[PDB]
Design a protein around this nucleic acid. Structure first.
Ligand SMILES: [Zn+2]
Ligand SMILES: [Zn+2]
Lengths: 252, 672, 276, 255, 250, 255
RNA sequence: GGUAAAAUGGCUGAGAAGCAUUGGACUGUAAAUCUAAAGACAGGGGUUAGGCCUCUUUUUACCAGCUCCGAGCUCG
């Protein structure tokens, strides 16, 4: 069960991160929101109750994550679940011959810094906090869940920067799982498809929802939260990328 | 000095083995009274001859020097550079007579230490020779007695003294201490000990033993009156630990002799080898004969004052301590032997099959060995019983009488009376060396049986005359017991050399009842002869001896009833047989079949062969094989082929081992 | 305990005796009835102390002393890879049988040497590219050999990738496909056969009693073979019996398509003048 | 939730199939065991209670599956979940040069007939029963879950026949999901690693300890109860479709 | 190089199999066509010259493959390359609710028997012939190349039977490569996309859906990839998608 | 054929990059070496002949790549092939509990900057040069080949930074192929396994003989000449696009 | 069946010592290490100050003994 567990959710002030926070707190767990101060996460933390605490920090900055982790340890005393639902996206073709446009290097670096560099920055820091926990009778110390979109396998036109960042997370999920296996930490990656997040939200949405084989609708963030809970409860789930897409194969 | 010294009784004085001791030491080995068959007995019981420095002979007599030639050719093949003999001064003349029939023996070196020579000392023992002359250059009244004194040994330093002495332990300073304490001294400056008695073992004084030979009552008084004996007997100077007596029991019961032994002291032991021993000497021979007797009893008949009677392998330690060891005493039990034979994988069924299937002259094969005596086969010898009252010996090898005595037991005296003539074929050793033993025993048997001493008839090459003449003139009177006939005078084309020779051969024909006697020159060596006997009954027996396939033998022995032929080698080494002037198995078979004899027998098997020869498919109902102490009659010819399966079963393992060795030799030859 | 002085004084004399002694080996010392056995036992203890003390000085001598693709974690990786190969060999590898029926004929000294050779033989098989499927037949539980084996391997005994059983070779394989290797066999091994099962007797036999393995094989009517040592190399000195480690290395070379002149490289050079 | 759902589990008399049946019945659902009559599935059906009914049938036979499906419809009235946990395995190298042995064609055909042909035979038949269900307010008619081992991606030596059958299930899970998408049926595949099933415990004991130690985390053999938990999660989640999930423990199999 | 090599091509009387045969024979190698007698492969064998011999056999039958392999050994003496380009395809939905139609089991079994069972039947038999070859100085005994369509990863509607058979080949290519690694045989799989084979308005639309080049596949290009695999000694245990970056839609 | 083609090879002064340069120049093509000036690439350019020109530039810097591309255009007039064989590697565990060590962020950023950021920086710039070429009669304008190690699928312990960079290249090879499809540029990725590049032929021998023994067939380290052969095959084949090819030898890497 | 020489049970020696072997270590790139285990010169005996004396086994070499003197194929 997830009763009494303490979880740290990056970017949990909106989108997929908030949905997992709502479910875990409702099930009886405690959550810490880790997202930029401009997102107004303190309003969501107050709404969810006394079990939710907003920690203003930036994933790309080492100092901010360490400060937020110390706040979580001070408030609750331990960290058991780490969910990385933070990440930005950009849309720009690599090269447009007709328009004479070339992809800017700053845009590629900025996306890589948040999606990939930020995710690894969090993982390497929470594990240090996560390593001090007394082993569970099953030998487990905690669960770390990442989020890389389905673009890591099938990118679209102009989705080169997004696919590269998401592709790195999928590739690196196995070495990290092997890295933390002796200390007893499980690392998993979820591959959501088209989800009703603010990042995705009119004619395009209806067409994209119709392109999903079944169900022919956009993803529900509540369903994403359900999959996260299933991974936490199952002790044999490790080192896999799960496509929460709906059997949709993306076209150019 | 040596740390252990003990004696051993190789032969316990029995009539068929004589008496012999064996002194063992870490530095030297000694032998006493090397008689006939001593070489075979010592080899059987695994007695090494590598360092046999000295051999002591107590009396110039054939009962003590009979096996001397065999030991000499053996030590030589052993590689010993020099051997020293001790005893009567006649040994030098005896050694000269040995070279008549043997070679010069250039390899080994011979030395003689007579009693008149100065005393001899060794690294382990000092030996004194005592010449004794009986009451009333050949000398027939000299007997030498030996008194052996061991060297005094030091005493070990008491190593536990290191807790009290001031000497630096584990250093070189022990060497002057060792030179002091072991010699009875002590370095008092290292402490207070002025003598080794405080820290060293008491040195052991030398313990002496005496070997005394008293062949007859005539020697009793000279032994008693000897002053040199009184030096050790009536004194406390190292009382003699043990005295070995080799004298007949009639001598022992004499009061003067009884008082002589008792004067040596109460602690002195007394060991006696006086022909009263009851001990089996040839265990392997007894084992095989008992096993073969289980097949056919007739073809393989069965064989036959405090003091300590000697036994085979009896021991007595002298240097470590002084006890009657008695640990390797032989034990003869026919029940164990038959159990081992019956438990053989194929012996039981084979003899069962043969048994459920179901007179003069008779032949007894005393020995079927070629060159050296072995555990199972003695040197060549064959006895023929023409009539219940007459017999003929076909070859007299070394120790032949010993085998004869074992075969007949107490009946040997009667058998020797029936001995009419002895035939010697070619003058190699181990073919004639046993003759003096037969003659002396024959004289004793005739005296015991109460018969006139008529000289025996001997058919042999003229070269044998010189050998016996020199021995008779120099060492001991023999020639007055025989009337020798040259072998050449009995040839088919021979001529009467002298009327006395014609008179003797006529006497031989009358004595043996033979119709005719013939000889021929076989191709083995210079003056090598065969033989053939025809009886008035009509049966003919042909003996070849050492030879090669020859035509004169075939012509002379035509239509023989039974043929005995040499089978030294097999078909594998026919080249060696030609080089060594011997015949192979198939060569003998071919010669016999060409001669058209009713039956064929083989003997003179090589030392390469251990127990049985190779049974080639050419072995027909006429071809047989010979073993020691087997009896063959003319009615047993059809039975002989039937015995092949049981003999194969009784010797399955060794023939497999022999076949395996031959296969490996062939493989090595091919791969060479 | 009279042993105390018996020795201390010999230690003072320095007559090749151990510097110290323990209780358990002292009881074994008084369980030796012959002075030669005690002398040999004391020399065995004496040389054990000297080699132990001499090798200690080597530690004192040793005390006087970017971009990378991988981490130095190699002893683990080699062990894991050899484990994976062994696991596959336990399913598809060619069986090889070590017969432990010779426990009766071995004294304590030979029993320890048998275990040491078995440890070496198993190690060589593990490192091979195509390992065998090592069987330990007739291994009686709580026996002298079994107790020694679990002592040397400690916890590894339960994890070694080999089949250990109390049954016999005949009870696990068809009698036709079994070949009992021995030096006394009349048949000469010509070529390695991949369809057969080879049995190697776990024997040392210093006090030579030849024919023990041959008698055991003939008792069950099993085929026998002897390595063709003489045919390929010229023998000079030494018994033709070979150690277990040498035998398994010879078989491994033959199993891997090697020729006889290459397999026999593991025979000690102190017996064969050279090849033919 | 899974309360009131009716499920058909192939090979549910032992191994992974029984574990899912125990969990689903315990949660309040109804299950039908579909396994060969010689497996003694009636004993398990009696043990689980009145919500479990044993249907003796063979997956490779069309007639047997149709008879069992009719029994399930008669007993409960509908079919909502189909789980395929039945399958045999063989171990034989493709070609052994040293031993001169070649993989027999009958062994390859027999494994293919049960693992792959049997799975497709069930799927095409339950969907006809599954198609008659009234659509759920979310548009779903039912869930179909398959089982293909991790050998479909990383086979071992001598596991050629097993990998080919399991590989076909992984490849075909996407066309079937697209095939049944308009009618509203979700098709999923689970890839268990080393699990404590009777199919795996047949191996010698030393092998099991070594194989359990080779799993990075947890360093133990799979628990069939954990496999049942994953099946329940797939049923509850409505957005899970057309994916192969490796329930292995991050273990990568070696030759 | 491929000069002097002997290759056995299943289904080489038409489609992709013939294209590889034309290239390998042209490069100087020798090829044996293994396809059903009704395909008229003897005409192609005569056209290609004396280095091509037609062997009438059925992949699904063990006896026919063994007879053809013996013919290849008798004619040339060795086998070095085995290419499996034979296979049929069917199109039928798993279940059609509106029409009340269900996929027939016989159609699924027939496709599985030829595409998957036939491929494994050939592989297990040629390797026995392939194992007797003397090892090359690089340790190689030969190369085996399979063909599984891109449907093994991304099937279409009604392509369930085809994807299952092709999916099995992709999954089994790794155990077979590990199986034959000690004896020195390399096993590879090629995943062609839309190719201008006889098996393939729809054509124009499908050709336009390929990102680049926007045209149907050329069987000559497939033959070129086969030659590259043979020459490269480090290519083993991989599935290569010769598709053109096309991702298939439902 | 590759006769007359002009190729730009990043990091071609050593390792895999030099091997492709030697083969392409030998076949008759023209190559431009793009590697850091400290690597001494001018010596290799002089050795290969007049068809090889060394361009000192840094992939992580936009200005350096643009300068080198202008030099290639000035020397030869066109660019047809772009091969990315440049990249560094690091070995460090994510977290070592026993030693209390944590992976440094600078090491992760440095590896990502060269392997992934550098590769994309080159690709976006050569395509602008590559776009001005007149289309070939087959519609092709040029070929771009990347290099991402097999760690992108199966990383080892401490290979987290390397796998993340290589994993991004594998993931992004498909969007770039779709991006440049209308203009007629083919993008491919090669996944070399354990190749005997200068770096790996420097580890102690025992190590070199283990790694090499773990490859199923051939049981040896990779030969850079073989890597060059695969590059030539991709250039000649016009239907090869949007695929990752594992030039490893069927080796599956263990933890 | 005999004669002589030899015998290193992981391998070479020396007559001490190296190359090796087994269990353990999550090694920061000398782990080229640390730590634990096993170290019996064919096997028995004796003695012994070593070192020698002996028994057995194995391996490798090796295994008949016509003497005289003059006639000079026979004569003593
Ligand atoms: Zn003779
Ligand atoms: Zn003679």
């Amino acid at each position: 069960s997830v009763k009494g567990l303490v979880a740290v959710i990056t970017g949990g002030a909106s989108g997929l991160g908030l949905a997992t926070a709502e479910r875990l707190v409702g099930q009886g767990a405690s959550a810490v929101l880790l997202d930029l101060p401009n997102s107004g996460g303190e309003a969501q933390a107050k709404k969810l109750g006394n079990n939710c605490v907003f920690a203003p920090a930036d994933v790309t900055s080492e100092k901010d994550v360490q400060t937020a982790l110390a706040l979580a340890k001070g408030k609750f005393g331990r960290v058991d679940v780490a969910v990385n639902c933070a990440g930005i996206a950009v849309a720009s073709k690599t090269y447009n011959l007709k328009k004479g446009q070339t992809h800017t290097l700053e845009d590629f670096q900025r996306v890589l810094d948040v999606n990939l560099m930020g995710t690894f920055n969090v993982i390497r820091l929470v594990a240090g906090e996560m390593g001090q926990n007394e082993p569970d009778q099953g030998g487990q110390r905690g669960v770390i869940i990442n989020t890389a979109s389905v673009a890591a396998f099938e990118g679209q036109v102009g989705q080169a920067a997004y696919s590269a960042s998401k592709g790195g997370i999928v590739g690196m999920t196995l070495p990290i799982a092997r890295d933390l296996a002796p200390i007893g930490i499980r690392v998993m990656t979820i591959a959501p498809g088209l989800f009703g997040t603010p990042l995705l939200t009119e004619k395009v949405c209806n067409f994209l929802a119709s392109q999903v084989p079944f169900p022919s609708r956009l993803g529900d963030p509540a369903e994403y939260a359900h999959l996260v809970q299933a991974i936490i409860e199952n002790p044999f789930l490790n080192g896999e990328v799960i496509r929460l897409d709906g059997a949709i194969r993306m076209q150019p | 000095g040596p740390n252990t010294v003990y004696l051993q009784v190789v032969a316990a004085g029995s009539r068929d083995s004589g008496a012999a001791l064996y002194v063992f030491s870490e530095f030297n080995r000694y032998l006493f009274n090397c008689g006939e068959g001593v070489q075979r007995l010592m080899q059987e019981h695994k007695l090494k001859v590598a360092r046999l420095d000295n051999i002591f002979l107590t009396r110039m007599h054939w009962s003590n020097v009979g096996g001397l030639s065999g030991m000499i050719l053996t030590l030589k093949e052993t590689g010993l550079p020099k051997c020293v003999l001790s005893g009567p001064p006649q040994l030098e003349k005896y050694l000269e007579a040995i070279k008549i029939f043997s070679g010069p023996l250039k390899g080994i070196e011979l030395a003689v230490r007579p009693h008149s020579a100065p005393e001899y000392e060794d690294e382990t023992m000092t030996v004194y020779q005592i010449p004794i002359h009986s009451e009333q250059v050949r000398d027939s009244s000299l007997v030498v007695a030996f008194i052996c004194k061991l060297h005094l040994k030091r005493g070990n330093f008491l190593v536990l003294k290191a807790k009290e002495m001031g000497l630096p332990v584990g250093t070189a300073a022990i060497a002057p201490i060792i030179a002091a304490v072991k010699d009875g001294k002590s370095i008092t400056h290292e402490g207070r000990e002025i003598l080794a008695e405080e820290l060293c073992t008491p040195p052991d004084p030398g313990a002496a033993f005496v070997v005394v030979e008293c062949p007859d009552e005539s020697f009793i008084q000279p032994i008693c009156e000897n002053a040199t004996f009184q030096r050790y007997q009536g004194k406390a100077d190292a009382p003699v630990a043990l005295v070995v007596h080799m004298a007949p029991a009639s001598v022992l019961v004499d009061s003067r002799y009884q008082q002589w032994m008792e004067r040596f002291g109460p602690d002195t032991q007394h060991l006696v080898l006086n022909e009263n021993c009851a001990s089996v000497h040839n265990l392997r021979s007894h084992k095989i004969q008992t096993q073969l007797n289980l097949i056919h009893p007739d073809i393989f008949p069965l064989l036959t004052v405090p003091m300590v009677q000697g036994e085979c392998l009896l021991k007595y330690q002298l240097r470590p301590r002084r006890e009657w060891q008695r640990d390797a005493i032989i034990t003869c039990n026919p029940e164990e032997f038959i159990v081992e034979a019956l438990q053989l994988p194929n012996f039981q069924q084979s003899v069962q099959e043969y048994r459920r299937s179901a007179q003069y002259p008779e032949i007894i094969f005393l020995g079927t060995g070629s060159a050296i005596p072995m555990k199972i086969r003695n040197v060549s010898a064959t006895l023929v019983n023409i009539s219940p009252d007459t017999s003929l010996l076909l070859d007299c090898g070394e120790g032949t009488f010993g085998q004869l005595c074992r075969h007949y037991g107490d009946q040997v005296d009667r058998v020797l009376g029936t001995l009419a003539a002895v035939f010697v074929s070619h003058l190699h050793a181990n073919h004639h060396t046993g003759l003096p033993s037969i003659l002396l025993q024959r004289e004793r048997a005739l005296a015991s049986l109460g018969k006139p001493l008529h000289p025996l008839l001997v058919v042999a090459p003229n070269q044998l005359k010189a050998w016996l003449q020199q021995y008779h003139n120099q060492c001991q009177e023999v020639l007055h017991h025989i009337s020798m006939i040259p072998a050449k005078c009995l040839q088919e084309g021979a001529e009467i050399s002298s009327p006395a020779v014609e008179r003797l051969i006529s006497s031989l024909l009358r004595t043996c009842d033979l119709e005719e006697f013939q000889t021929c020159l076989v191709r083995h060596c210079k003056h090598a002869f065969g033989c053939a006997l025809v009886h008035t009954s009509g049966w003919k027996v042909v003996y070849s001896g050492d030879t090669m396939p020859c035509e004169a033998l075939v012509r002379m022995g035509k239509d023989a009833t039974l043929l005995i032929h040499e089978a030294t080698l097999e078909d594998g080494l026919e080249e060696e047989a030609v080089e060594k002037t011997h015949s192979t198995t198939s060569q003998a078979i071919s010669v016999g079949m060409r001669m058209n004899a009713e039956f064929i027998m083989l003997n003179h098997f090589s030392q390469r062969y251990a127990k049985v020869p190779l049974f080639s498919p050419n072995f027909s109902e006429k071809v047989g094989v010979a073993f020691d102490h087997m009896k063959v009659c003319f009615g047993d010819f059809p039975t002989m082929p039937k015995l092949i399966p049981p003999l194969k079963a009784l010797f399955a393992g060794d023939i497999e081992e022999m076949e395996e060795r031959r296969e490996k030799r062939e493989l090595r030859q091919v791969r060479a | 305990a009279a042993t105390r002085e018996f020795i201390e004084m010999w230690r003072l004399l320095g007559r090749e005796v151990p510097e110290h002694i323990t209780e358990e080996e002292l009881k074994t010392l008084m369980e030796c009835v012959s002075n030669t056995a005690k002398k040999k036992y004391l020399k065995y203890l004496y040389t054990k102390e000297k080699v132990k003390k001499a090798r200690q000085i080597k530690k004192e001598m040793k005390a006087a002393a970017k971009n990378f693709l991988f981490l130095r974690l190699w002893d683990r990786n080699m062990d894991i890879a050899m484990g994976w190969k062994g696991a596959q060999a336990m399913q598809f590898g060619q069986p090889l049988v070590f017969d432990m029926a010779y426990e009766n004929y071995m004294k304590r000294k030979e029993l320890q040497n048998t275990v040491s050779q078995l440890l070496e033989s198993e190690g060589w098989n593990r490192r091979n590219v195509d390992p065998f499927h090592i069987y330990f037949c007739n291994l009686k539980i709580d026996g002298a050999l079994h107790r020694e084996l679990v002592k040397r391997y400690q916890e590894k005994w339960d994890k070694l990738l080999l089949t250990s059983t109390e049954k016999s070779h005949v009870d696990l394989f068809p009698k036709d496909s079994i070949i009992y290797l021995t030096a006394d066999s009349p048949n000469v091994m010509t070529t390695f056969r991949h369809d057969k099962v080879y049995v190697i007797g776990s024997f040392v036999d210093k006090s030579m009693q030849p024919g023990t393995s041959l008698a055991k094989a003939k008792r069950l009517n099993l085929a026998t073979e002897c390595l063709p040592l003489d045919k390929y190399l010229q023998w000079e000195i030494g018994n033709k019996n070979l150690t277990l480690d040498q035998m398994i290395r010879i078989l491994l070379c033959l199993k891997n398509n090697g020729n006889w002149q290459e397999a026999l490289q593991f025979v000690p050079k102190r017996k064969h003048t050279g090849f033919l």
